[PDB]
Amino acid sequence: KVINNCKIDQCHAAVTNHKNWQYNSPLVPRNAELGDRKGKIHIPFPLANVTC
Amino acid sequence: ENTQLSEAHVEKSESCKTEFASAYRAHTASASAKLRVLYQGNNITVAAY
Numbered sequence: 001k002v003i004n005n006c007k008i009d010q011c012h013a014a015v016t017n018h019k020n021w022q023y024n025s026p027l028v029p030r031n032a033e034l035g036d037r038k039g040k041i042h043i044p045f046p047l048a049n050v051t052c
Numbered sequence: 053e054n055t056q057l058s059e060a061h062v063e064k065s066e067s068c069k070t071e072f073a074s075a076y077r078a079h080t081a082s083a084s085a086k087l088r089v090l091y092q093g094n095n096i097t098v099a100a101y
């Protein structure tokens with residue numbers, strides 16, 4: 001697309017359509033005011049008792 | 053005129069099922085004993101409260 005009578009400045013662009021999910025780190029901004037959940041995954045390697 | 057919102061809270065760790073300390077209250081105790089008795093040339097053992 002082409003826009004007439006405008007400078008290179010005063011314009012903003014972004015990519016807006018995604019088809020995958022991602023973990024919600026505190027280093028990335030939120031999608032919207034109330035987040036929508038899509039799934040979950042587990043943490044491996046539990047603890048146990050042993051002798052030394 | 054941009055803003056930022058932050059929040060946090062506190063929870064309990066999963067490792068509390070293995071590493072923990074317990075606080076108790078005590079009362080009066082009981083007693084028990086074990087003995088050896090020599091009776092007509094033989095050794096016998098008894099156990100009682």
Ligand SMILES: *[C@@H]1O[C@H](CO)[C@@H](O)[C@H](O)[C@H]1NC(C)=O
Nearest residue numbers: 047048049050068069070071
């Ligand atoms: C062994 O681990 C279990 C949990 O896995 C815990 O309940 C128990 O107190 C542990 N015992 C010792 C002696 O560490």
Ligand SMILES: *[C@@H]1O[C@H](CO)[C@@H](O)[C@H](O)[C@H]1NC(C)=O
Nearest residue numbers: 088090091092093094095096
């Ligand atoms: C068992 O009795 C004998 C005597 O018949 C004695 O010499 C021995 O010391 C007794 N046993 C123990 C463990 O004291």
